[PDB]
Amino acid sequence: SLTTTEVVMENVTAFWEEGGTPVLKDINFKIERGQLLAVAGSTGAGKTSLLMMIMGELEPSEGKIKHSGRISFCSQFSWIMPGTIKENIIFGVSYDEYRYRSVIKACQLEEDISKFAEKDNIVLGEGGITLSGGQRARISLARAVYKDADLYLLDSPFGYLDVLTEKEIFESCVCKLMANKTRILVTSKMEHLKKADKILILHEGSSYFYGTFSELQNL
Amino acid sequence: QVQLQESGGGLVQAGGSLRLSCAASGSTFAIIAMGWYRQAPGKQRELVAVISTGDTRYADSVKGRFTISRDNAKNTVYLQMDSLRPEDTAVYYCNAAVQVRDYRNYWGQGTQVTVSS
Amino acid sequence: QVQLQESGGGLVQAGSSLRLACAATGSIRSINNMGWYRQAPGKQRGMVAIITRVGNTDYADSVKGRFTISRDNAKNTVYLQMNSLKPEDTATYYCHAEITEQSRPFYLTDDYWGQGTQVTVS
Ligand SMILES: Nc1ncnc2c1ncn2[C@@H]1O[C@H](COP(=O)(O)OP(=O)(O)OP(=O)(O)O)[C@@H](O)[C@H]1O
Ligand SMILES: [Mg+2]
Ligand SMILES: [Mg+2]
């Protein structure tokens, strides 16, 4: 409707297996440009599937989904492709010195890059350096956030991070660096929900809560 | 814990098309991301396309011509190569980022793509 | 009405091995990630090892190959098996857990920390 509405779901139901259990049932939300939507809920609630729908990997059986522009997705499982740290961050996107430095900093990769003699030109892989789980999760988040997009779909990017690093990156990256970007963050932490403009709590594909942090706290 | 096998490579004239496929097999595995690389003799392997889940990236040299896609039910990735040029001549490899209880990447053994003038 | 409690700490010699335990008690509905952290005087607190509800692990480079983190979901307890102890391992070891309390209407977590146990390596 309005140019400032980034993503809308109206009366959305969807199925992974035709004739089976709906993975999402009667979903409704509207996200304005620059807002942070937190998507909470237990294992199997339909959180990753909700992102998949936005990405066109799962079409709804009913209802309407609309999103403006380009998406950048961060998978709940971190990954790399054999190559340099720098290529693992920027591949497929033009180099921009400032953005690059700001992303490395916000994702706490500055320190790790400085330990190598080849710095961000260090080759990742069996035959080079093997990143730890934590390093791989930070580089996967940096890859997603570096890309210029109208909508960032961050699927539990801190699931494999320690809580001290998670707090720092949630604050420096998701809240500060990305302050005016449209973000859908899959997280069930109260520490994160506190900062969201809107919250969707999914339970077995259904919307158990949709509203502000004040409305949630009141419940 | 995973084996990758490419197919679809061969001889084609400039302007023509080719569809590369990469089949992952094994027993217990979850593919996180799949990439396509190309290697000219005596040179480094060059990443040309990568797909995680519905998020794709391309090397500048291949944009608008190559398309990476997945058959999620089948553990396969494809590289649709259109408007092929002689400089696309190389061995093409697929690479899979996988969870087999620990994180690992696996290489395929490659498929020759030869583009004539 | 939720508590984490570390045990198994003490004064040991270099090259020795020790096992730390951290039990989550109280009005627990569920637990996501759990982990071990440490802080030495003058130095900042940092991760040692973390473990997901599924049992996936990660270690700080300084402890990998020497320490093992394990989890028992039935007992809501996380363990740190420390082998090949070095004087650089001397610190207060803290346990963390992402916990959903019973009085919460939704599947939401809050971060909890233990009081800590001292590990002094001679
Ligand atoms: N790519 C997929 N293809 C087919 N089915 C899927 C896919 N991803 C998830 N499902 C199924 O959809 C249902 C909802 O799961 P989903 O992964 O959306 O949950 P989730 O909320 O992300 O869980 P978690 O918190 O554990 O990541 C599950 O039955 C799941 O196995
Ligand atoms: Mg607005
Ligand atoms: Mg998920």
Author numbering:
A (entry chain A): 386 to 404, 437 to 636
B (entry chain C): 1 to 117
C (entry chain B): 1 to 122
Paper text:
Cystic fibrosis, is a life-threatening autosomal recessive genetic disorder that originates from mutations in the cystic fibrosis transmembrane conductance regulator (CFTR) gene. The most prevalent mutation is the deletion of a phenylalanine residue at position 508 (F508del) within the first nucleotide-binding domain (NBD1). Although it functions as an ion channel, CFTR belongs to the ATP-binding cassette (ABC) transporter superfamily from a structural and evolutionary standpoint. We report here the development of nanobodies against NBD1 of human CFTR, characterize their interaction with the target, and demonstrate the ability of several of them to thermally stabilize CFTR by 10 °C or more.
For example nanobody D12 was observed in 3 different crystals: the ΔRI-D12-T4 complex (diffracting up to 1.95 Å), the ΔRI-D12-T8 complex (diffracting to 2.90 Å) and the ΔRI-D12-G3a complex treated with papain (diffracting to 3.00 Å). Comparison of the NBD1-D12 interfaces (residues with atoms closer than 4 Å) leads to Cα-atom root mean square deviations (RMSDs) below 0.41 Å. Nanobodies D12, T2a, and T27 recognize the same epitope located on the edge of the α/β-core region, including the first residues of the Walker A motif and the last residues of the Walker B. A set of hydrophobic interactions are observed towards the tip of the CDR3 loops of these nanobodies. This loop sits on top of the Walker A motif, where hydrophobic side chains from the nanobody occupy a small cavity present in the neighboring α/β-subdomain (see L108 in D12). Although nanobodies T4 and T8 share no sequence similarity in CDR3, the crystal structures revealed that they bind NBD1 in the same location, a groove which includes the γ-phosphate switch loop/Q-loop with an overall binding interface of over 900 Å2. Close inspection revealed that for both nanobodies 3 hydrogen bonds are formed between CDR3 residues and the Q-loop backbone, for example between Y103 and N105 in T4 and the carbonyl of I497. Y103 is also interacting with R553 in the α-subdomain of NBD1 through cation-π interactions. R57 in T4 (R58 in T8) makes a hydrogen bond with the backbone carbonyl of R560 and importantly also with the backbone carbonyl of F508. The stabilizing effects of D12 and T4 nanobodies were additive in combination, leading to an apparent melting temperature of the complex of 68 °C, which is 24 °C higher than isolated 2PT-NBD1. Importantly, binding to two different stabilizing epitopes act on the protein in distinct ways, as incubating NBD1 with D12 and T4 produced additive effects, suggesting that several sites could be targeted to maximize therapeutic benefit.
